[PDB]
């Protein structure tokens, strides 16, 4: 990977960046938290 190319095997900040995006979107939506509410020692269904 010559310097001229300007690309390294999976850059640190690049993998980090992907992690950042996924974290922010999932937590903001909180879709998981809402779904969990449905379950919680429920009695039954009509």
Short mmCIF file of C-alpha atoms in Angstrom, two decimals:
data_model
loop_
_atom_site.label_atom_id
_atom_site.label_comp_id
_atom_site.label_asym_id
_atom_site.label_seq_id
_atom_site.Cartn_x
_atom_site.Cartn_y
_atom_site.Cartn_z
CA UNK A 1 0.00 0.00 0.00
CA UNK A 2 2.16 2.83 -1.32
CA UNK A 3 1.80 6.23 0.35
CA UNK A 4 0.68 7.73 -2.97
CA UNK A 5 -2.50 5.66 -2.83
CA UNK A 6 -3.34 7.24 0.54
CA UNK A 7 -5.08 4.10 1.85
CA UNK A 8 -4.11 1.90 4.80
CA UNK A 9 -5.51 -1.57 5.77
CA UNK A 10 -8.73 -0.55 7.53
CA UNK A 11 -7.79 2.87 9.05
CA UNK A 12 -8.38 3.26 12.85
CA UNK A 13 -10.72 6.25 12.60
CA UNK A 14 -12.55 4.57 9.68
CA UNK A 15 -13.72 1.54 11.60
CA UNK A 16 -14.32 3.90 14.52
CA UNK A 17 -16.48 6.12 12.31
CA UNK A 18 -18.75 3.23 11.35
CA UNK A 19 -19.12 2.39 15.04
CA UNK A 20 -20.10 5.99 15.77
CA UNK A 21 -22.90 6.07 13.21
CA UNK A 22 -24.49 2.81 14.35
CA UNK A 23 -24.41 3.84 18.02
CA UNK A 24 -26.12 7.19 17.51
CA UNK A 25 -28.92 5.95 15.26
CA UNK A 26 -29.94 2.94 17.36
CA UNK A 27 -30.03 4.84 20.65
CA UNK A 28 -31.98 7.80 19.22
CA UNK A 29 -34.68 5.54 17.78
CA UNK A 30 -34.93 3.57 21.03
CA UNK A 31 -37.03 1.08 19.03
CA UNK A 32 -35.57 -1.75 21.09
CA UNK A 33 -36.57 -0.14 24.39
CA UNK A 34 -40.17 0.22 23.22
CA UNK A 35 -40.43 -3.40 22.08
CA UNK A 36 -39.14 -4.64 25.44
CA UNK A 37 -42.04 -2.85 27.16
CA UNK A 38 -44.44 -5.29 25.47
CA UNK A 39 -42.84 -8.10 27.48
CA UNK A 40 -42.49 -8.05 31.27
CA UNK A 41 -44.39 -10.66 33.28
CA UNK A 42 -47.52 -10.06 31.21
CA UNK A 43 -50.75 -11.81 32.39
CA UNK A 44 -52.26 -12.87 29.07
CA UNK A 45 -53.85 -11.74 25.80
CA UNK A 46 -57.54 -11.14 25.07
#
